[PDB]
Write a protein that holds these residues in place. Structure first.
Motif, short mmCIF file in Angstrom:
data_model
loop_
_atom_site.label_atom_id
_atom_site.label_comp_id
_atom_site.label_asym_id
_atom_site.label_seq_id
_atom_site.Cartn_x
_atom_site.Cartn_y
_atom_site.Cartn_z
N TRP A 1 1.11 -0.97 0.05
CA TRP A 1 0.02 -0.43 0.18
C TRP A 1 0.64 1.49 -0.06
CZ3 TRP A 1 0.90 -2.77 4.16
CH2 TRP A 1 1.21 -2.58 5.20
N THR A 2 0.02 2.31 -0.36
CA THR A 2 0.91 3.68 -0.17
C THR A 2 0.25 4.77 0.16
OG1 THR A 2 0.95 2.99 -2.72
CG2 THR A 2 1.27 5.63 -2.17
N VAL A 3 0.84 5.56 0.90
CA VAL A 3 0.73 6.70 1.63
C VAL A 3 1.73 8.27 0.34
CG1 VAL A 3 0.12 8.24 3.65
CG2 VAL A 3 -0.28 5.94 3.44
N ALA A 4 0.61 9.11 0.57
CA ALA A 4 0.88 10.14 0.03
C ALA A 4 0.88 11.15 1.54
CB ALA A 4 0.24 11.06 -1.36
N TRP A 5 1.89 12.06 2.30
CA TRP A 5 2.07 12.13 3.00
C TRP A 5 1.46 14.12 2.45
CZ3 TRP A 5 2.31 9.39 6.36
CH2 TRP A 5 2.63 8.22 6.82
N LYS A 6 0.52 14.42 1.91
CA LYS A 6 -0.25 15.65 2.03
C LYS A 6 -1.67 14.97 3.05
CE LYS A 6 -2.22 19.12 -1.09
NZ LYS A 6 -3.52 18.00 -0.43
N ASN A 7 -2.15 15.70 4.50
CA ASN A 7 -3.92 16.21 4.07
C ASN A 7 -3.33 17.31 4.16
OD1 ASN A 7 -2.74 16.69 6.95
ND2 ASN A 7 -2.78 15.15 8.10
N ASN A 8 -5.08 17.98 5.34
CA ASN A 8 -5.31 19.21 5.42
C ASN A 8 -4.88 19.34 6.79
OD1 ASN A 8 -7.22 19.15 3.52
ND2 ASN A 8 -9.07 18.04 5.58
N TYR A 9 -3.50 19.12 6.90
CA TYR A 9 -2.67 19.27 8.19
C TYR A 9 -1.10 19.97 7.39
CZ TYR A 9 -6.25 17.94 11.30
OH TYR A 9 -7.63 17.92 11.48
N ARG A 10 -0.41 18.83 7.07
CA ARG A 10 0.78 19.33 6.42
C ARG A 10 1.13 18.43 5.47
NH1 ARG A 10 4.73 17.97 11.09
NH2 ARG A 10 3.49 18.20 12.78
N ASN A 11 2.02 18.82 4.43
CA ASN A 11 2.57 18.12 2.89
C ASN A 11 4.03 18.00 3.29
OD1 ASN A 11 3.08 17.41 1.26
ND2 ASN A 11 2.31 18.82 -0.36
N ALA A 12 4.30 16.70 3.60
CA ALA A 12 5.51 16.97 3.22
C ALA A 12 6.71 16.43 2.39
CB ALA A 12 5.73 15.13 4.68
N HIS A 13 5.15 16.31 1.51
CA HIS A 13 5.65 15.87 -0.69
C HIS A 13 6.69 15.10 -0.74
CE1 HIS A 13 4.57 20.36 -1.39
NE2 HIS A 13 5.79 20.89 -0.47
N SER A 14 6.18 14.46 -0.15
CA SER A 14 6.74 12.39 -0.12
C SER A 14 5.70 11.05 -0.06
CB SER A 14 7.76 12.57 0.59
OG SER A 14 7.03 12.75 2.55
N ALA A 15 5.92 10.47 -0.35
CA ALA A 15 4.96 9.32 -0.94
C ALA A 15 5.56 8.10 -0.12
CB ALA A 15 5.07 8.74 -1.83
N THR A 16 5.02 7.33 1.11
CA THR A 16 5.51 5.88 1.64
C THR A 16 4.84 4.88 0.72
OG1 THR A 16 6.18 6.80 2.96
CG2 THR A 16 6.45 4.60 3.64
N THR A 17 6.06 3.52 -0.02
CA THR A 17 5.16 2.39 -0.50
C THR A 17 5.58 1.41 0.58
OG1 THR A 17 6.85 2.21 -2.21
CG2 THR A 17 5.17 3.74 -2.39
N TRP A 18 4.64 0.69 1.21
CA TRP A 18 4.78 -0.72 1.68
C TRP A 18 4.86 -1.83 1.23
CZ3 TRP A 18 2.98 3.97 4.07
CH2 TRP A 18 3.50 4.45 5.60
N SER A 19 5.77 -2.33 1.03
CA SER A 19 5.26 -3.71 0.87
C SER A 19 5.95 -5.15 1.57
CB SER A 19 6.41 -3.79 -0.58
OG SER A 19 5.99 -4.65 -1.70
#
Lengths: 125, 125, 125, 125
Positions: C66-84
């Protein structure tokens, strides 16, 4: 005596403009110096590693790896990179690698200790 | 002369039951043998690597890495593993690593050449 | 209808204290939220992924990612993590993962764009 | 509404000859299909992922990731790949990725569960 001893030994350059100078020993040893074009680094750093001195003959690459700890007389970036890859011989010889760059961290920051990437080394440029 | 020269040098065991026997040199060198409990391996294999001989003093780990090419007098698995990680000293000393295991392949199979994983080494068990 | 649909769906916690809330769909879908205990993050972020809805029955794990892009209504860390990784069912169910965290960078800094690590998720703690 | 929504959405091809067909949603979603030129795969597989819908404007890439579980109506390779990377816009737009391919395994074989590599996607070829 190593099958690709002659093909590996020498000066290699990657896509970043870094320079890898290596000697491959008959027994599997790799020794030399690395100079990175990027990062917290200046001048040459000691490297050591190993390679498969009797690889498969079937068109397969030659597995190898090496380490640099990023301490020399000029700088200490408290980190080490290991490249793991294969040497592919021939007119356009290449070493294709993936690497792991671990920094010393506190235990609280260990989750963000390790960078990963890929370098391709050629004999020209 | 290396800050953790004494703390690193010795026998380490990981979660797989593998045994890592290392000597850390004053200058940054790592030399020793590795015996894997798993995989296409038997008995001991030569390892070499490097570590940060003057680490940060601030509770931070000591960056290090090393390579094994999986050829010895018993077997040749045409592959090499590099571990990249940090030594964390103290009552429960650990070396926490991530590794890349590259096999020699044809160019057509190079996409599936490289395994990745993580090993934690302790001084007991 | 998914073999581990029931076993995967729910709330998971990793060794960092992060919380993964997932629903596994009959078809292979993963949807939910992730809250990281560390890093440039606050509150929940959208995740999506996939899993093997008809795994091997032979004691083997269930592959997923799965993937998370690290943008929500509070913060944007201009990054994405994928777990495999893989889901391992049973009394002590676990999801064992490796991850890649890529930051947006300039081309000059792309060599240092990507962190790698490993998380183990459990149903307690 | 996503900054690179238009630049990401469409058909991409990597160095292996694989085809990635994606739609980027205003909100950060990625949905589409993947067809691999290599491996235990045939035809299209569902993908889902996420991207940074409000990236930095400073010449930096756009972080993104996505997952494929390798089950469709034709085959099941009991595995999942996650790509983690960044979109770089412009005349020669690219998505530069690293990936982790985890197979379902027994616990005894989990050490060899996960392949790692790198794919570069372009809009032509």
């Amino acid at each position: 005596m190593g099958r690709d001893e002659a093909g590996i030994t020498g000066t290699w350059y990657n896509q970043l403009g870094s320079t890898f100078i290596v000697t491959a020993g008959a027994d599997g040893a790799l020794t030399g110096t690395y100079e990175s074009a990027v990062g917290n680094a200046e001048s040459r750093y000691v490297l050591t590693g190993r390679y498969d001195s009797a690889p498969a003959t079937d068109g397969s690459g030659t597995a190898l790896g090496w380490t640099v700890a990023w301490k020399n007389n000029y700088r200490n970036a408290h980190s080490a990179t290991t490249w793991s890859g294969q040497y592919v011989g021939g007119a356009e010889a290449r070493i294709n690698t993936q690497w792991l760059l671990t920094s010393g961290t506190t235990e609280a920051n260990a989750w963000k200790s390790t960078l990963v990437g890929h370098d391709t080394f050629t004999k020209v440029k």
